[PDB]
Ligand binder design. Sequence first.
Ligand code: NA
Length: 90
Amino acid sequence: KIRLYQFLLDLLRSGDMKDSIWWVDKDKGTFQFSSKHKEALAHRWGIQKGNRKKMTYQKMARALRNYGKTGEVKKVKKKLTYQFSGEVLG
DNA sequence: AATAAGCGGAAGTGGG
DNA sequence: TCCCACTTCCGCTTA
Ligand code: NA
């Protein structure tokens, strides 16, 4: 199965959910979720994973925070904003 | 209060 | 056995 950070990066590259997620500064790898339309993207993640329960943004962000230590994705001090590592962006 | 983003400990699930 | 890579649950903090 695909990893969560790669799912998000693939979405950003494809543009398929441009109303739910977008680059802020793509050169820096910063991206931001829509306040109003992030749940639809969370739902798609859970369906892609085949999880038992409906995926929510809160649970998706709970997974995102676990990348903070290893570095793939870090929270930016801006609303609903995160940053991919250079390694992830290669 | 209502609404929302953010946090993480702890326990459960997947697939090695 | 026991880690991977989250998922699920719960309670809390800040704005
Ligand atoms: Na929120």
